[PDB]
Design a protein around this motif. Sequence first.
Motif, PDB file in Angstrom:
ATOM      1  N   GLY A  57      37.641  49.632  31.881  1.00  0.00           N
ATOM      2  CA  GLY A  57      38.027  50.217  33.078  1.00  0.00           C
ATOM      3  C   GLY A  57      37.440  49.638  34.292  1.00  0.00           C
ATOM      4  N   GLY A  58      37.010  48.302  33.930  1.00  0.00           N
ATOM      5  CA  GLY A  58      36.108  47.513  35.049  1.00  0.00           C
ATOM      6  C   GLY A  58      37.217  46.997  36.272  1.00  0.00           C
ATOM      7  N   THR A  59      36.471  46.831  37.472  1.00  0.00           N
ATOM      8  CA  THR A  59      37.191  46.208  38.467  1.00  0.00           C
ATOM      9  C   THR A  59      37.070  44.598  38.571  1.00  0.00           C
ATOM     10  N   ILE A  60      37.944  43.688  38.967  1.00  0.00           N
ATOM     11  CA  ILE A  60      37.644  42.315  39.015  1.00  0.00           C
ATOM     12  C   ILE A  60      38.152  42.328  40.524  1.00  0.00           C
ATOM     13  N   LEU A  61      37.374  41.404  41.132  1.00  0.00           N
ATOM     14  CA  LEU A  61      37.926  40.734  42.567  1.00  0.00           C
ATOM     15  C   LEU A  61      38.214  39.499  42.336  1.00  0.00           C
ATOM     16  N   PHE A  62      39.657  39.335  42.795  1.00  0.00           N
ATOM     17  CA  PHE A  62      40.234  37.951  42.983  1.00  0.00           C
ATOM     18  C   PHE A  62      40.098  37.312  44.201  1.00  0.00           C
ATOM     19  N   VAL A  63      39.711  36.028  44.394  1.00  0.00           N
ATOM     20  CA  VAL A  63      39.384  35.449  45.554  1.00  0.00           C
ATOM     21  C   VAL A  63      40.232  34.109  45.609  1.00  0.00           C
ATOM     22  N   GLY A  64      41.106  33.997  46.611  1.00  0.00           N
ATOM     23  CA  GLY A  64      42.039  32.911  46.572  1.00  0.00           C
ATOM     24  C   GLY A  64      42.377  32.674  48.102  1.00  0.00           C
ATOM     25  N   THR A  65      41.939  31.502  48.619  1.00  0.00           N
ATOM     26  CA  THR A  65      42.216  30.814  49.904  1.00  0.00           C
ATOM     27  C   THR A  65      42.777  29.382  50.014  1.00  0.00           C
ATOM     28  N   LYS A  66      42.952  28.926  48.969  1.00  0.00           N
ATOM     29  CA  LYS A  66      43.178  27.369  48.936  1.00  0.00           C
ATOM     30  C   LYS A  66      44.419  27.096  49.493  1.00  0.00           C
ATOM     31  N   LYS A  67      45.404  27.963  50.104  1.00  0.00           N
ATOM     32  CA  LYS A  67      46.573  27.782  50.675  1.00  0.00           C
ATOM     33  C   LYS A  67      47.543  27.348  49.562  1.00  0.00           C
ATOM     34  N   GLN A  68      47.067  27.101  48.375  1.00  0.00           N
ATOM     35  CA  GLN A  68      48.140  26.913  47.290  1.00  0.00           C
ATOM     36  C   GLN A  68      48.225  28.018  46.127  1.00  0.00           C
ATOM     37  N   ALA A  69      47.174  28.953  46.383  1.00  0.00           N
ATOM     38  CA  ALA A  69      47.054  30.109  45.374  1.00  0.00           C
ATOM     39  C   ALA A  69      47.143  31.440  46.178  1.00  0.00           C
ATOM     40  N   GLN A  70      47.261  31.366  47.377  1.00  0.00           N
ATOM     41  CA  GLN A  70      47.513  32.700  48.251  1.00  0.00           C
ATOM     42  C   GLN A  70      48.430  33.659  47.733  1.00  0.00           C
ATOM     43  N   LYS A  88      36.301  50.532  45.912  1.00  0.00           N
ATOM     44  CA  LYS A  88      35.456  51.901  46.577  1.00  0.00           C
ATOM     45  C   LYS A  88      34.244  51.524  46.354  1.00  0.00           C
ATOM     46  N   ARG A  89      33.601  50.512  45.385  1.00  0.00           N
ATOM     47  CA  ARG A  89      32.156  50.214  45.151  1.00  0.00           C
ATOM     48  C   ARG A  89      32.264  48.743  44.857  1.00  0.00           C
ATOM     49  N   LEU A  90      31.153  48.270  44.514  1.00  0.00           N
ATOM     50  CA  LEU A  90      30.886  46.924  44.342  1.00  0.00           C
ATOM     51  C   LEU A  90      31.873  46.575  43.147  1.00  0.00           C
ATOM     52  N   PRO A  91      32.608  45.474  43.075  1.00  0.00           N
ATOM     53  CA  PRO A  91      33.349  44.802  41.656  1.00  0.00           C
ATOM     54  C   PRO A  91      32.511  44.728  40.456  1.00  0.00           C
ATOM     55  N   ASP A  92      32.945  44.825  39.436  1.00  0.00           N
ATOM     56  CA  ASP A  92      32.264  44.455  38.155  1.00  0.00           C
ATOM     57  C   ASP A  92      32.318  43.153  37.801  1.00  0.00           C
ATOM     58  N   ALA A  93      33.200  42.189  38.515  1.00  0.00           N
ATOM     59  CA  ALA A  93      33.325  40.969  38.146  1.00  0.00           C
ATOM     60  C   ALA A  93      34.363  40.496  39.460  1.00  0.00           C
ATOM     61  N   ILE A  94      33.942  38.892  39.433  1.00  0.00           N
ATOM     62  CA  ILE A  94      34.866  38.316  40.505  1.00  0.00           C
ATOM     63  C   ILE A  94      35.740  37.317  39.748  1.00  0.00           C
ATOM     64  N   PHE A  95      36.895  36.846  40.453  1.00  0.00           N
ATOM     65  CA  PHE A  95      37.749  35.850  39.797  1.00  0.00           C
ATOM     66  C   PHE A  95      38.078  34.794  40.956  1.00  0.00           C
ATOM     67  N   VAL A  96      37.588  33.658  40.841  1.00  0.00           N
ATOM     68  CA  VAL A  96      37.787  32.654  41.836  1.00  0.00           C
ATOM     69  C   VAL A  96      38.710  31.488  41.387  1.00  0.00           C
ATOM     70  N   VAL A  97      39.518  30.903  42.242  1.00  0.00           N
ATOM     71  CA  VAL A  97      40.412  30.029  42.311  1.00  0.00           C
ATOM     72  C   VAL A  97      39.728  28.405  42.396  1.00  0.00           C
ATOM     73  N   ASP A  98      38.985  28.298  43.122  1.00  0.00           N
ATOM     74  CA  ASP A  98      38.258  27.101  43.573  1.00  0.00           C
ATOM     75  C   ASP A  98      36.745  27.534  44.047  1.00  0.00           C
ATOM     76  N   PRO A  99      35.692  27.367  42.901  1.00  0.00           N
ATOM     77  CA  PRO A  99      34.397  27.820  43.477  1.00  0.00           C
ATOM     78  C   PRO A  99      33.922  26.851  44.539  1.00  0.00           C
ATOM     79  N   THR A 100      34.294  25.826  44.785  1.00  0.00           N
ATOM     80  CA  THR A 100      34.001  25.006  46.060  1.00  0.00           C
ATOM     81  C   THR A 100      34.336  25.344  47.253  1.00  0.00           C
ATOM     82  N   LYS A 101      35.697  25.715  47.172  1.00  0.00           N
ATOM     83  CA  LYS A 101      36.383  26.102  48.783  1.00  0.00           C
ATOM     84  C   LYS A 101      35.871  27.630  48.900  1.00  0.00           C
TER      85      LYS A 101
END
Length: 235
Positions: A60-73, A151-164
């Motif tokens: 039941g954990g929450t995962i934050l998805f982070v995408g800004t590369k303009k190719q994965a938005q 609602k609270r801090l996430p339990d994990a994050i998912f990144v598409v480009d860790p450099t961007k």
Amino acid sequence: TVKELLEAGVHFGHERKRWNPKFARYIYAERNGIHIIDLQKTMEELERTFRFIEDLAMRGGTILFVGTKKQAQDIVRMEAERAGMPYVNQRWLGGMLTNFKTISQRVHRLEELEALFASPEIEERPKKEQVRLKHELERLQKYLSGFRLLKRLPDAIFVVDPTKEAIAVREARKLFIPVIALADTDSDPDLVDYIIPGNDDAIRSIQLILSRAVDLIIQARGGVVEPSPSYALVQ
RNA sequence: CGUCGUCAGCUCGUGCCGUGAGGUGUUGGGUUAAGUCCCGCAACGAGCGCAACCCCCGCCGUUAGUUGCCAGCGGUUCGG
Ligand SMILES: [K+]
Ligand SMILES: [K+]
Ligand SMILES: [Mg+2]
Ligand SMILES: [Mg+2]
Ligand SMILES: [Mg+2]
Ligand SMILES: [Mg+2]
Ligand SMILES: [Mg+2]
Ligand SMILES: [Mg+2]
Ligand SMILES: [Mg+2]
Ligand SMILES: [Mg+2]
Ligand SMILES: [Mg+2]
Ligand SMILES: [Mg+2]
Ligand SMILES: [Mg+2]
């Protein structure tokens, strides 16, 4: 979970330059001045990464998805708009995690303005505010589109480009948050806790990986969902 | 109370950077009378300022005729 041979377009990395030596262990060779990812180690790390994803999802954990590369938005905006994992789409705001309380205050203002546009109080305090608060709610929805679910801090994050998205990675490290990332040759693998050595520029790589990941997430909580409507975003 | 000076500024909270004094935000691009607003941004907001809310002058209406008019008519020592 059946992406063995279907990895069409993932092995293509970046050029000879703009790489990171720490990634050499995940590189097979160099064809025509372009790094190509090792196909074996890809699934080798995919086993452990998807296993961690399944474990965290069936808990039941929450995962934050982070995408800004303009190719994965446009992909993240719906793969996370599936099973309720939140997401960050337009740009990653400094302090979304270490200063999570202030961003949550911004979210409170967002839902406050949503409540004001639901109540008959839209007409009082005339048109000046009716335009100011309108544009304010517009930009609050533009930036806090998926973030409003945390609602609270996430339990994990998912990144598409860790450099961007290096700022988000750093903030996750500061709070001991596990970092899942689709890394390419232009990134430092040591900062990523669960690496996925694929391509971050092509659309098919991101679509494949994120579709299979969200499918594994919903499969860990039962009720397998239909194939995601992200194929039409090939264009 | 005068003054810099109606000048466009001075700071804070949290986060972030630096061993530290401090920095970031407040820099930048566009814009405005303005730190005014827009866009961008490791920053996200806020306070004292700016502006607005107050008063006066500009147009019109409502309410009210010991001020006003042969506008309208009568009388007129013809001076509302
Ligand atoms: K140093
Ligand atoms: K400026
Ligand atoms: Mg001024
Ligand atoms: Mg500070
Ligand atoms: Mg120094
Ligand atoms: Mg320090
Ligand atoms: Mg300071
Ligand atoms: Mg300063
Ligand atoms: Mg500066
Ligand atoms: Mg201001
Ligand atoms: Mg700024
Ligand atoms: Mg009188
Ligand atoms: Mg009178």
